[PDB]
């Protein structure tokens, strides 16, 4: 085994390997997609592998739904390494670790490079990861120039609807690191004040009154409230929003299962935000 450093922690893992089981870390699925890593175990979404991942799940068995690792299945696999998530309860990470060397992959989007390089070190694809990272940075440089100065001064928010409720995220979490950090838009105080994924009322949103709203809605994450979006859209308080009246609401401009803090999420969000904020596909 070889010493792998990841966010001031060291793990001994047999590398390079393909015996990788991914549970909870949708981030690592997105890194696997761009690195062309075909893991032994991957996350299922309502019992299937989404079309967007089918090119890297061809060799994989499901580890379970994102939040619900099947420890018996993961044991069955005897992976060289398990890519878990920092979003699991600690007790659940401990249980996962009974099936093998377990690395909790960070959901903090500012760690996107470290996450990619982790998977790259595990699979011998450092050169490929660095090229991907370099290409994002070049894309960011070019894209920033294509977005008008008024757009860059607007009040923009990313929300995700889960079980029919509205969630915001910290400045360095989800897509916010790209929207505020990379593109330079100003994070609303409610985002600055968020300590983690945080429920926001439609009432509070109406006071924030953003100019632009990116709404992410996965049917899979709203099985309890399937019409949540149409219901929202008919609400008088939602209808009072500046963004809603100006037709500046962008629903699923990136696939709603996208996690935000990955190369792939960032490049997709960079382009979507460019198009939507400038209201022109040329961006």
């Amino acid at each position: 085994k070889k010493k792998i450093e990841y966010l001031d922690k060291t793990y001994e893992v047999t590398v390079p390997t393909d015996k990788i089981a991914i549970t909870g870390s949708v981030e690592s699925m997105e890194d696997a997609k761009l690195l062309d890593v075909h893991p032994q175990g991957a996350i299922s979404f309502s019992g299937k592998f989404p079309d967007m991942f089918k090119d890297i799940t061809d060799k994989a068995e499901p580890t379970g739904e994102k939040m619900e690792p099947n420890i018996e299945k993961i044991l069955e696999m005897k992976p060289d390494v398990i890519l878990a998530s920092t979003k699991f309860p600690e007790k659940t990470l401990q249980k996962i670790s009974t099936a093998g060397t377990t690395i909790p992959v960070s959901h903090i989007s500012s760690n996107w490079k470290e996450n990619m390089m982790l998977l790259a070190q595990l699979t011998g694809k450092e050169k490929k990861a660095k090229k991907i990272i370099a290409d994002y940075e070049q894309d960011l440089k070019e894209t920033k120039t294509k977005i008008n100065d008024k757009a860059k001064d607007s009040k923009a928010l990313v929300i995700r609807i889960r079980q029919g409720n509205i969630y915001i995220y910290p400045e360095q979490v989800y897509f916010n690191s790209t929207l505020y950090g990379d593109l330079g838009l100003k994070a609303p105080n409610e985002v600055k004040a968020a300590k983690a994924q945080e429920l926001i009322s439609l009432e509070k949103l109406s006071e924030m009154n953003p100019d632009h709203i990116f709404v992410q809605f996965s049917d899979d994450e709203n099985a309890d409230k399937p019409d949540a979006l149409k219901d929202l859209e008919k609400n008088p308080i939602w209808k009072s929003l500046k963004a809603v009246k100006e037709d500046h609401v962008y629903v699923n401009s990136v696939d709603p299962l996208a996690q935000g803090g990955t190369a792939w999420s960032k490049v997709r969000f960079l382009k979507a935000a460019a198009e939507k904020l400038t209201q022109n596909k040329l961006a």
Partner: peptide, 6 residues
């Protein structure tokens, strides 16, 4: 599933 929407 607590990164808390829990």
């Amino acid at each position: 599933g607590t990164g808390t929407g829990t």
